[PDB]
């Protein structure tokens, strides 16, 4: 049977999720929408040819007994309150990052879900679902390169919009690595430090530092070096290299595009959009959520604990952003509920 | 049970590796379809497919019985290649839509038979599974070629590499099972027609375990505009499954990049990456895209828009010529008829 | 002790050999030169600051007893007479390809050399000294891919000069692969066939077919497929792929230059000159020759017999060029002298 | 005419330099040697068929009036005194790194050299002569990627000898990056910080930390992240990547070896020794020195001032190895003598 979905938030993010559920993935249907902007909600129904009703707010939608699961895909600041409400219900929950924009709010959600019969929340960290990244982790876990000593990564983006702030280097960009690394290494973070090299001439947003360097440390002593470069011009790219005791593993170059021999050069195109780069990951992620719901079983993707870990780490990062000093992280052991 | 817009009920004829793969995708990945019936010459294989993919589906003892189930909207012919002909023919006696894996038939006579029969119908119902046309990388290459950036295509060099074959793999299947892909592909890629084909036999591999199988095989094809195509067919290559495509142009070259998701490993005095061992895995996107298109047409009760029985026939003409060439390694001329209105 | 050299022909390749012998390699000195253009000869002496004498012709240069070795680096058609003359002396002989422009001319030379006490001729097939190519052959010889079943190669050239003829597709270009393959494979040719694909619009030389496809066959049954493309525009490139029973080998991309990430592309430069590409091969070839002359030992590199094999194959190819028909090749057994 | 050379130190590096001078490069002859192990020096003469005098020590060798230049190649601690002694003569001086093991010693040499009527010292920083590295720098200097914001590098080695100490991670290994970066960027350092990730289980030397992370800052604000990893097992590798405002540049993979398709992978070999990696670089470096000496012009390669910079940076780094704290660097203006 079909999973009956309600979507909370109908901006571009919400719309993309709607499109995915309606036209790409199997086994689901969007039967309700709401947004603070009621007209954007109506617009979603119209544009996507849904048999859905428009609720005026999350509370009312969430009372609809025929909805199996909700997608919390509003703007980030709105997630906390909405997740909280949905936790009053028996509905399954898929929220986009972040779990909450603050670390107490995330702790709140975790504390509340810990009161329940079963896990219901999945957090939308798609990286874990990327075929390349996943294959790398799997290879690492074989033990073929021994213990991971150092991780070097890059999060490269061509340019940013006028509204992109310094904090967003963490919250919108680095957040992906933040969730990824502890999962990759099966280890916990003990510190983060953000440093700033010389400022790029490409920046034209007030207060935005670019590029940024983020160093993280783990319990077992693995050191993580991440390059964040969001005005790089050339393209969108995600690089990942694990340095092990007896060898190394890195992601291959991404691209299906042909190699062109022409004009004293050999070249291949480079992806310009993060949307395109991670189409597969997003599809796989959401299909898994649906699959689990269809079985009335808890999600097996990133949990609220994962969201909370990320929230903590990002808070620390934003603190490091002020003065470039190291900030210690101490994440309490994973509750059994989240194990 | 007829969701977002009408759930296509599917019957699957042949539940080997490929058939299993189609079932998986139709059940678990693609939208708007359900497999409600299967069959295979090995009844235990059919049963295993129903079990393994958690289907609520009938197991029929043969193709004819399955084809007489009124509730099925479309059939997939995924049996042994030499079985395709009879099954397609039988199916054309129904109103069901038909997706057949390559080849359309193993003989020219067979292919013509199917075209002749389908031409007697009010509407086109057959799609042939030439999935290369749907491969993102192959399409990207074609797109780029068609911008004119390398000028005219002068020579194409390609490889169809396969690690090992089953005991039923015949010399003739080097053409009908394997080279068939390149045969369809190149004329689509170049928007051109063939004028000849020649098969030559280099030094026989010690890895061959099938009586009468020559491997590797070289296929040289010529086109109307004069483009020369050099295909390497190597099916006991051991190392992996691999498709290579290189187009030599007047002012440049275009090449298909290496296929892989897997990581680069630095270890033991080598830098290395995994090579795919299975054609099923390698073309998973192509298969998904292709089959979804088919399903999407069936849903609307419209004719398929992908490769047709005529494309099957064109390929079969060339394949036949190759099978003939296989006998003396001499060049065999080719002249394909114009496309009937039905297939335009 | 130092190898004293006479150079015959001081064109571009000649000056190159002189410059190499003078300023790059060790253990030789050029003490005599000649060229059809006596002023070209004079120039070479002048420009490279040699203590050398200038002779009117080859014969006269050859009567200088101070000379240990001669380099025959004149127009290929003059090579034959010059080599035969040099053989009337005691001197070691390095000749740029070809050994002779007719196989009857090649046979003449071999027959003459066969009347000597020791071997003195090295033919300049530099491909054999290229590190990449050598490394491929070495790997092949490990048996790691089983027996070689098919070879696929490309000889790519961006453009040709106005003196470039259809026959030069064989004699100046394909000649390198002609020598290379039998050595690569420890084999002998049984046939050759030249076919013409559609003619390139880039061709500006009268009578020239481009590209050309050459197919050779060997006694062990290996099939060789060479693409000759001399108006390819994009660059100079040599490609080599060996298809084995249990694996494949191929040359990597040539280049020390950086990978550039820019403007929605990833790219590397492509070499435009065969001269630049084969610097190392040439240096290695010649240094070895000198090293052997310094020891009064016969050269170990390609021989007059290799020259002959090439002449026969090339003749057969020029014949095939008439009608695109397969031409048979029957290489006679190797005399012990050349073993 | 021929540059007459003395070699001080006939160990591995010394013998390699001897081989180079004798059998590979042009226009030099080794006519005198010494080693603290007299038998090693004698062996060198035998093994390389030198017409050379064996001296009992450096001082005595330096008394030889026939010698045009000396190579200081003994163990690093010795270097300092030997170079100073050489400065008492008029001979040209090529010293392998370091210039001296104490920054005080380095300055002593610079000071002494400044008293002379021409620059005589070349320091053996071979990386500057590497074709790949040079080519990257050249492309960088075109401005095609804009300003260099970050540099990421790796110095990878498979295993070390039992005599390899913690401080040698700086002095024997990172020292190459220490000279290189400031040349590449045409910028000076402001700080250095050494950081220890978890300890590899492959380390078998008392006190050695591996891997080590080096962060350097420059005056224009470029940040340099070097990974030093000397027990990596898999091979020897040098990596370099420059992150720019509008693009990136990186060294391609090193290797002329073939691509092998076998056993469900595609692979290429990796060098196991630094020796083959930089043969070209060493050859180019020394041939340049010999060429200058032959003209009696000062060397144009890295100088004692470059040695001083390296020493200061190295010292600051050995200091950082104690507490993993950042150490400031403030190098004085370059004396006109050394521009």
């Amino acid at each position: 049977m079909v999973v009956k979905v309600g979507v909370i938030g109908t901006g571009a993010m919400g719309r993309a999720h709607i499109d995915r559920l309606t036209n790409v993935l199997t086994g689901a249907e969007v039967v309700a929408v709401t947004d603070i902007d009621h007209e954007a909600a109506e617009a979603a129904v119209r544009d996507f040819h849904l048999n859905a009703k428009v609720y005026p707010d999350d509370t009312s939608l969430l009372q609809d007994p025929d909805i199996d699961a909700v997608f919390v895909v509003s703007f980030g600041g709105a997630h906390e309150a909405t997740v909280l409400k949905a936790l009053d219900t028996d509905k399954f929950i898929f929220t986009e990052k972040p779990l909450a924009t603050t670390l107490e709010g995330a702790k709140r959600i975790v504390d509340k879900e810990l009161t329940k019969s079963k896990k219901v929340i999945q957090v939308g960290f798609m990286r874990r679902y990327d075929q390349g990244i996943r294959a790398l982790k799997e290879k690492l876990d074989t033990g073929i390169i021994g213990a991971p000593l150092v991780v070097r990564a890059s999060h490269i983006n061509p340019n940013v919009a006028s509204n992109y702030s310094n904090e967003m280097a963490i919250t919108d960009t680095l957040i992906h690595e933040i969730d990824e690394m502890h999962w990759l290494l099966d280890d916990e973070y003990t510190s983060i430090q953000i440093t700033y090299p010389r400022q790029s001439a490409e920046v034209r947003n007030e207060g935005l530092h670019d590029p940024q360097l983020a160093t993280l440390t783990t319990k077992k002593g693995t050191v993580i070096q991440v390059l964040v470069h969001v005005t790089a011009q050339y393209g969108y790219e995600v690089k990942l290299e694990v340095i092990g005791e007896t060898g190394e593993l890195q992601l291959p170059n991404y691209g299906l595009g042909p190699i062109l021999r022409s004009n004293a050069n050999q070249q291949t195109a480079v992806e310009m959009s993060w949307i395109n780069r991670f189409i597969q990951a997003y599809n796989t992620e959401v299909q898994e959520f649906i699959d689990e719901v269809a079985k009335s079983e808890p999600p097996v993707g990133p949990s609220a604990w994962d969201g909370y870990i990320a929230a903590i780490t990002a808070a620390a990062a934003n603190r490091s952003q002020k003065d470039q000093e190291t900030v210690l992280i101490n994440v309490a052991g994973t509750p059994t509920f989240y194990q």
Side-chain angles (χ1 to χ4, degrees), chain A residues 99-100 102-108 110-111 123 125 303-314 330-332:
Chain A
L99 181 60
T102 67
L103 62 168
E104 291 85 15
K107 177 52 175 181
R108 212 133 51 216
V110 157
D111 288 335
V123 180
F125 288 122
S303 70
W305 191 249
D306 292 306
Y308 177 50
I309 296 183
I312 292 168
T313 306
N330 182 32
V331 264

Side-chain angles (χ1 to χ4, degrees), chain A residues 78-107:
Chain A
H79 295 179
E80 190 189 329
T82 293
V83 169
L84 288 177
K85 285 175 193 185
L87 284 177
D88 286 334
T89 81
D90 281 344
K91 304 193 190 327
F92 289 100
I93 298 157
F94 183 100
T95 186
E96 273 289 341
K97 42 150 283 245
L99 181 60
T101 63
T102 67
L103 62 168
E104 291 85 15
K107 177 52 175 181

Side-chain angles (χ1 to χ4, degrees), chain A residues 24-330:
Chain A
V24 183
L25 310 189
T26 181
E29 183 192 1
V30 179
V31 305
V33 292
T34 180
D35 194 79
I36 34 191
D37 182 335
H38 180 96
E39 170 49 38
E42 289 183 348
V45 181
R46 227 180 280 126
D47 297 346
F48 297 104
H49 307 86
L50 309 180
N51 276 15
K53 62 194 51 155
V54 179
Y55 288 93
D57 71 321
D58 55 354
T59 295
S60 50
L61 183 154
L62 281 165
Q63 292 308 294
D64 191 342
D66 294 308
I67 292 180
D68 295 312
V70 293
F71 277 66
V72 187
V73 292
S74 63
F75 176 97
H79 295 179
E80 190 189 329
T82 293
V83 169
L84 288 177
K85 285 175 193 185
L87 284 177
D88 286 334
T89 81
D90 281 344
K91 304 193 190 327
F92 289 100
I93 298 157
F94 183 100
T95 186
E96 273 289 341
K97 42 150 283 245
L99 181 60
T101 63
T102 67
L103 62 168
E104 291 85 15
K107 177 52 175 181
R108 212 133 51 216
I109 281 165
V110 157
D111 288 335
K112 189 168 187 181
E113 183 184 50
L114 289 169
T115 69
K116 293 324 174 190
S117 26
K118 61 182 201 184
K119 186 172 67 168
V120 291
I121 299 172
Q122 175 165 349
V123 180
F125 288 122
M126 20 69 45
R127 288 282 190 99
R128 309 204 185 186
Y129 294 94
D130 180 77
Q131 285 178 17
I133 294 177
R134 215 202 293 127
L136 192 148
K137 167 173 181 61
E138 265 149 43
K139 201 56 178 179
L140 175 60
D141 291 339
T142 60
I144 191 175
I145 69 169
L149 306 174
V150 182
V151 180
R152 309 180 117 192
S154 301
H155 194 158
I156 309 295
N157 182 86
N159 264 117
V160 295
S162 287
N163 72 330
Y164 189 110
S165 68
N166 202 51
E167 309 199 298
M168 291 161 61
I170 310 307
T171 56
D172 289 22
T173 299
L174 186 64
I175 196 71
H176 294 285
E177 284 74 30
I178 280 174
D179 173 78
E180 186 184 293
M181 297 313 178
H182 67 84
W183 163 78
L184 178 67
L185 295 170
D186 191 17
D187 198 345
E188 310 153 10
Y189 301 146
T190 57
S191 66
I192 196 162
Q193 175 186 38
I194 305 298
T195 55
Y196 301 145
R198 58 188 294 190
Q199 175 79 339
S200 165
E202 296 302 322
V203 178
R204 48 190 92 162
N205 298 20
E206 199 183 0
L208 175 65
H209 288 275
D210 195 56
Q212 307 189 15
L213 299 174
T215 300
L216 290 73
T217 58
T218 76
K219 229 178 202 178
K220 300 187 167 185
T222 304
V223 177
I224 298 147
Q225 301 180 321
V226 185
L227 169 58
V228 173
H229 194 182
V230 302
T231 66
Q233 310 303 306
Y234 83 81
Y236 184 82
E237 195 174 356
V238 166
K239 310 168 162 182
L240 172 63
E241 167 184 30
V242 182
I243 312 291
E245 293 170 323
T246 71
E248 308 180 350
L249 290 161
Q250 82 184 47
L251 289 180
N253 248 301
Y254 182 86
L256 298 185
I259 303 153
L260 173 68
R261 282 166 164 75
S262 173
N263 193 36
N265 285 305
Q266 176 181 330
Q267 67 181 250
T268 53
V270 171
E271 183 61 67
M272 298 292 301
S273 147
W274 62 269
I275 293 169
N276 290 332
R277 168 64 182 86
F278 289 113
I279 293 290
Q280 175 265 304
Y282 281 105
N283 290 340
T284 301
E285 169 188 64
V286 181
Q287 191 62 78
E288 192 193 70
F289 176 77
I290 293 316
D291 282 4
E292 289 299 298
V293 174
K295 295 188 293 174
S296 315
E297 300 187 7
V300 291
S303 70
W305 191 249
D306 292 306
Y308 177 50
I309 296 183
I312 292 168
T313 306
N318 291 132
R319 234 176 79 193
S320 185
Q321 269 184 337
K322 310 276 175 64
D323 57 19
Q324 312 177 59
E325 319 278 307
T326 302
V327 176
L328 298 179
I329 296 155
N330 182 32

